[PDB]
Amino acid sequence: HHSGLVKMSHPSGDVEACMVQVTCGSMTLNGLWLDNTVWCPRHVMCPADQLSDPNYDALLISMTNHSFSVQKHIANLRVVGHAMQGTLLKLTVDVANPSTPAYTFTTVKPGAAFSVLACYNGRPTGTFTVVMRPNYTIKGSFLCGSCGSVGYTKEGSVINFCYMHQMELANGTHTGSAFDGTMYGAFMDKQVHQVQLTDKYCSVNVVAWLYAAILNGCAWFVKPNRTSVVSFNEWALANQFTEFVGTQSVDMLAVKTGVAIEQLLYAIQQLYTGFQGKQILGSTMLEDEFTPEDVNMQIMGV
Amino acid sequence: HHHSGLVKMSHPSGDVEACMVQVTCGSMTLNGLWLDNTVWCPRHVMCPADQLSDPNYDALLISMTNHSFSVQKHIANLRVVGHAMQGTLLKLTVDVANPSTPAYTFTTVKPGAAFSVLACYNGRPTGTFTVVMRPNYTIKGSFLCGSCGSVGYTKEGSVINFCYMHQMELANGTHTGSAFDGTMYGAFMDKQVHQVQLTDKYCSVNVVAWLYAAILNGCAWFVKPNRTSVVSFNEWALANQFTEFVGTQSVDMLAVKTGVAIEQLLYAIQQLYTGFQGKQILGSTMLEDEFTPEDVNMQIMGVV
């Protein structure tokens, strides 16, 4: 009955050690302390007065190092330099973080899972995992004061920082910056209504989920009928799906269950219409929030 | 806010990551929890796979010395200087106090309560997730060979409350484990035999919490003036696979905020149980009982 799939996050300790509070005038949000740098969203510079069409150039010029105050709650640090990269501030502080993990910066693509460490006032408060949606939003849990919370993946013991929280959209979803300063989805870090694109289903994750179903023996939807890749991709452009792209991870799944991608691409075309009275893993709808990697690791332990 | 703002949220695991160690005895190897000068681990680490059903724990313990247990940290070796059994756990004494022990308590959790799990293998933490202790005293986890001794916990202020140490998987794929007083949740036995769990039920108080989250999101089509009292609901619950509803201060805060009374939602549950008749609540077509009142207060209302 129970598949052994849960929404699984990375242990957050390495990232907890890097969170600080950043304060500038009257805004206070979270920042990420790596080596001698503190990253935080540039809208810390902006009075609540004027959070639409903020003039970030003039705000920055307006600033000095004494403007910014960095506290470490979970020491206090002196800012001695400040620059702006896209929608992020790069603050230079006098002490290096002694607990900086090995890390890289990366940009996540639609379909990919990452962990988030939600923080308020520099204090870590919860962790959860999201999938970057095809419209470059995430379905998170963020309240006033959460900006600067960060999202990351792990390769080995290396942390790959991929997200810093910036805002909530009209429909309740969220977006943020990559650490190159760019906002996922081209969204503006200005407090104005903005058009979210239509969401789509993450095909490879649906495929990974059906493989999960088969590994748990629930395989009724498996018919010998097969559908090609480039055709399925034809069908998906009109039916709110994304391109399918195999990966070694998907391939491992095909091989332990001896059910080929293409049987499942066929199954999805049938299942998009309805489960037709049946359940798959206790759901009546397709599930696109589990990756091939999630399923390999949780069910088979790679 | 077509997105609810509700996700499966765990506590930050850093505090607990620094207490995980690997414990080995003969060739069975699993995880333990290092707090000050004590290391807690499941007692079936003492057991050889051959003898893993019908094992003689009182005797295995006798056959051990302090050198029989090797304890190692990765996230050094530790010297065990005493050993003892406490229900289904071992309490080992080591000669170094964990320099990163958090403030902690040992509190057994009740059905409906949520806790965070730090899944670990060979003493290395690999993932974290949250679960609800089900009414049949199982949890719906993700655990594989090697995960035993993985721990579940809550946080209250500075204080971690350790509430679970993982022991086993059941026939239906769910899991159970010990509280740190040594008892097993659900009376299950640390023997490798097929054991059948009792029937599961809906956690009434959590379904209420979740219907308050719906109202807070503007989804209130299911709210009517009609009401069912807690007594009447609890009578109906016994017959319809629901737990007894017990109110708390956390539920009450949701009722104050929304203006919708607990008893209106108990009535709604009686109606919604038989089907949503084509509607959805927060994108679901069935009742959701995995979110607690505390969950909803914190995630939607920023309340602790």
Side-chain angles (χ1 to χ4, degrees), chain A residues 2 4-14 16 117-118 124-129 139-141 143 170-174 282 284 297-301, chain B residues 3 5-15 17 118-119 125-130 140-142 144 172-175 285-286 298-302:
Chain A
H2 177 54
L5 273 191
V6 301
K7 291 298 196 83
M8 177 99 68
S9 278
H10 289 120
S12 55
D14 289 343
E16 294 172 50
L117 183 69
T125 75
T127 189
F128 61 87
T129 181
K139 303 198 190 123
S141 185
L143 301 171
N171 66 350
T173 70
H174 301 96
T284 56
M297 299 201 282
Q298 285 185 48
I299 284 183
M300 308 197 293
Chain B
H3 174 52
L6 268 186
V7 316
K8 302 295 208 103
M9 177 94 70
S10 294
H11 294 93
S13 59
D15 279 357
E17 283 171 60
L118 184 61
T126 73
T128 193
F129 57 93
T130 184
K140 303 190 172 183
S142 187
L144 304 167
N172 61 2
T174 71
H175 306 100
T285 48
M286 89 192 42
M298 281 195 285
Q299 291 192 44
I300 302 208
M301 289 190 301

Side-chain angles (χ1 to χ4, degrees), chain B residues 5-6 16 30 34 44 61 76 88 105 111 125 148 151 162 168 170 179 198 232 260 268 281 291 304:
Chain B
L6 268 186
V16 179
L30 42 57
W34 180 30
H44 73 256
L61 188 73
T88 57
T105 61
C148 282
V151 307
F162 293 107
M168 72 201 303
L170 292 176
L198 309 192
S232 298
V260 178
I281 303 172
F291 291 107
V304 182

Side-chain angles (χ1 to χ4, degrees), chain A residues 6 8 10 13 24 38 89 95-96 107-108 112 139 172 176-177 182 197 218 222 224 230 246 277 284 295:
Chain A
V6 301
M8 177 99 68
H10 289 120
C24 167
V38 173
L89 295 197
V95 185
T107 290
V108 289
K139 303 198 190 123
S177 321
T182 61
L197 272 41
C218 175
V222 183
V230 298
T284 56
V295 175

Side-chain angles (χ1 to χ4, degrees), chain B residues 208-223 225-239:
Chain B
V208 164
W210 177 73
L211 296 178
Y212 277 118
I215 296 152
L216 293 168
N217 266 267
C219 179
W221 61 264
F222 52 81
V223 173
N226 306 73
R227 282 146 95 122
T228 304
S229 72
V230 167
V231 172
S232 298
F233 179 85
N234 286 343
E235 265 191 324
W236 170 94
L238 268 149

Side-chain angles (χ1 to χ4, degrees), chain A residues 30-48 50-65 67-70 72-73 75 77 79-108 110-122 124-154 156-189 191-194 197-199 201-222 224-233 235-239 241-242 244-247 249-277 279-284 286-288:
Chain A
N30 308 284
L32 183 65
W33 184 23
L34 308 179
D35 307 305
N36 289 107
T37 306
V38 173
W39 301 85
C40 72
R42 67 178 177 176
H43 72 257
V44 76
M45 290 201 279
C46 194
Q50 40 197 44
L51 285 203
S52 22
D53 89 346
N55 196 343
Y56 281 128
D57 286 351
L59 286 167
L60 181 75
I61 277 47
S62 129
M63 293 294 97
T64 72
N65 297 340
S67 300
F68 307 92
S69 175
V70 183
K72 205 262 172 203
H73 304 124
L77 329 167
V79 185
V80 308
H82 62 267
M84 159 154 99
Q85 205 174 315
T87 57
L88 300 184
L89 295 197
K90 218 166 100 143
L91 301 188
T92 304
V93 288
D94 57 357
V95 185
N97 182 356
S99 315
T100 303
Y103 75 86
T104 82
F105 294 126
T106 188
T107 290
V108 289
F114 62 97
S115 296
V116 172
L117 183 69
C119 301
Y120 299 79
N121 294 304
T125 75
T127 189
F128 61 87
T129 181
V130 286
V131 154
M132 185 43 83
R133 297 310 308 171
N135 63 350
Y136 284 95
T137 65
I138 58 171
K139 303 198 190 123
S141 185
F142 298 100
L143 301 171
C144 282
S146 60
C147 282
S149 298
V150 318
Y152 52 93
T153 71
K154 263 208 156 91
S157 229
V158 174
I159 294 189
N160 314 313
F161 287 109
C162 62
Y163 179 96
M164 162 159 295
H165 186 51
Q166 296 266 22
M167 56 183 336
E168 187 178 297
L169 295 164
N171 66 350
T173 70
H174 301 96
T175 185
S177 321
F179 280 85
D180 71 14
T182 61
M183 191 85 51
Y184 291 99
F187 294 100
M188 293 180 289
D189 59 343
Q191 191 157 298
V192 302
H193 176 275
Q194 292 177 56
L197 272 41
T198 36
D199 211 353
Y201 288 76
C202 306
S203 299
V204 60
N205 292 2
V206 177
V207 172
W209 178 71
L210 294 174
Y211 277 120
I214 290 150
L215 288 157
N216 257 260
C218 175
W220 67 258
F221 56 85
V222 183
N225 310 42
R226 308 168 92 262
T227 294
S228 83
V229 168
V230 298
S231 184
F232 176 87
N233 286 321
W235 169 74
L237 274 144
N239 289 103
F241 272 80
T242 62
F244 181 89
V245 177
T247 68
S249 278
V250 183
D251 300 328
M252 305 204 254
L253 283 195
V255 176
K256 169 87 189 233
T257 58
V259 171
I261 289 99
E262 285 83 0
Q263 267 147 288
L264 304 190
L265 307 201
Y266 172 82
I268 294 154
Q269 280 169 321
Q270 315 324 291
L271 294 168
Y272 181 48
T273 78
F275 288 12
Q276 306 265 38
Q279 291 192 282
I280 299 182
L281 290 175
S283 180
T284 56
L286 295 162
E287 166 74 79
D288 73 344

